[PDB]
């Protein structure tokens, strides 16, 4: 499904991403927007046999297993399909595990480029959550 901006922020809040390890809710809303336009079914293949899945475009070479990616590490111990659900539970859990690494949200290149160091609070600005 394709979330509404505010609808997604409310969900992300319910799922505890707001202020998770020092990252305000805006950061996550902004990241989702630029990564998949709030689309849970979004996918994108890469040069290697890996694919980015879900609202947060999580890679299948290091984070999830789709049973067909060379050098899969499945760090999130989850089937990549779980990241395409209308239920964001799984994508959030994995995102939290990713951001829990030393380099934090810098894992999402799209975040650094268009969200990192910006007034991200703008993304939840206006929402009645």
């Amino acid at each position, epitope marked *: 499904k394709v979330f509404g901006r505010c609808e997604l922020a409310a969900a992300m*809040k*319910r*799922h*505890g*991403l*707001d*202020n*998770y*390890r*020092g990252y305000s809710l805006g950061n996550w809303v902004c990241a989702a927007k630029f990564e998949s336009n709030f689309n849970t079914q979004a996918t994108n293949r890469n040069t290697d046999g890996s694919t980015d899945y879900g609202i947060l475009q999580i890679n299948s070479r290091w984070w999830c297993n789709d049973g067909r990616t060379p050098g899969s*590490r*499945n*760090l999130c*111990n989850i089937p990549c399909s779980a990241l395409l659900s209308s239920d964001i*539970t799984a994508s959030v*859990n994995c995102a*939290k*595990k990713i951001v*829990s*690494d*030393g*380099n934090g949200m810098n894992a999402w290149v799209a975040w650094r480029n268009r969200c990192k160091g910006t007034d991200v609070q703008a993304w939840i600005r206006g929402c009645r959550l």
Partner: antibody, heavy 113, light 109 residues
Framework: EVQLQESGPSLVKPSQTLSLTCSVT????????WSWIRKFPGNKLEYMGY???????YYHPSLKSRISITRDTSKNQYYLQLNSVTTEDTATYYC???????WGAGTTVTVSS | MDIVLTQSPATLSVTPGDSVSLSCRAS??????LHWYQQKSHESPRLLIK???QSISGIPSRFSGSGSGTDFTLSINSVETEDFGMYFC?????????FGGGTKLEIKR
């Protein structure tokens, strides 16, 4: 299938270094982030710190100064080093996956001269 | 400062078959980043509930969790004979991760 097991000196003298090993079996140590958790005498748990799947680390501030966590990708083990111990470091030490889904049986380390 | 988790009551005595509710309060809001652990004597801790209310495949259905922010509850629908021991909550919202002081489930007689 993934299983953890702690091992190391059960006795450490005050001011010396506490060293423990966690052997990861059934899977690669590079296949997850890992932690060290200790249990003091009155059911007081402390999350000492964890080492990511990348090798980077996060140390409990109260210990940031005495603690070091490392890993060995060839032997599939990660370690805990804790300097200048005192009787207060006496506790049951456990290693666990960052997710908390796997835990070693834990091992007691006693600090005494 | 570091997040403080307060669990109550310190100890709870029940008869197998009854239901119980264990409390855990955080000194600061942690949204849903609260996890519940069980630890039986001579055994290592076991994760029962993750992120406040998500169930772990393989954990008996009688165990469930609720709450958000600073107020969380672990519920056991009809405590079973093998359910007695310690119960601790733990937050992963901010570093350092911290544990509550634990609640002890003991048998009533």
């Amino acid at each position: 299938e993934v299983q953890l097991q702690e091992s190391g000196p059960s006795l450490v003298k005050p001011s010396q270094t506490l060293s423990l090993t966690c052997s990861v079996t059934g899977d690669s140590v590079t296949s997850d982030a890992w932690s060290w958790i200790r249990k003091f005498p009155g059911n007081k748990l402390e999350y000492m710190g964890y080492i990511s799947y990348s090798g980077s680390t996060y140390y409990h501030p109260s210990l940031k100064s005495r603690i070091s966590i490392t890993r060995d990708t060839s032997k599939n083990q990660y370690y805990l080093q804790l300097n200048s111990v005192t009787t207060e470091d006496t506790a049951t030490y456990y290693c666990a996956s960052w997710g908390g889904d796997v835990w070693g049986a834990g091992t007691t380390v006693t600090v005494s001269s | 400062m570091d997040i403080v988790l307060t669990q109550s009551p310190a100890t709870l005595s029940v008869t197998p078959g009854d239901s119980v509710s264990l409390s855990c309060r955080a000194s600061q809001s942690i949204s849903n980043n609260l996890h519940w652990y069980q630890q039986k004597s001579h055994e290592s801790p076991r994760l029962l509930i993750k992120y406040a209310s998500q169930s772990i495949s393989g954990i008996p259905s009688r165990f469930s969790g609720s709450g958000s922010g600073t107020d969380f509850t672990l519920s056991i629908n009809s405590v079973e004979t093998e359910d007695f021991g310690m119960y601790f909550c733990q937050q992963s919202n901010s570093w350092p991760y911290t544990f509550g002081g634990g609640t002890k489930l003991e048998i009533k007689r």
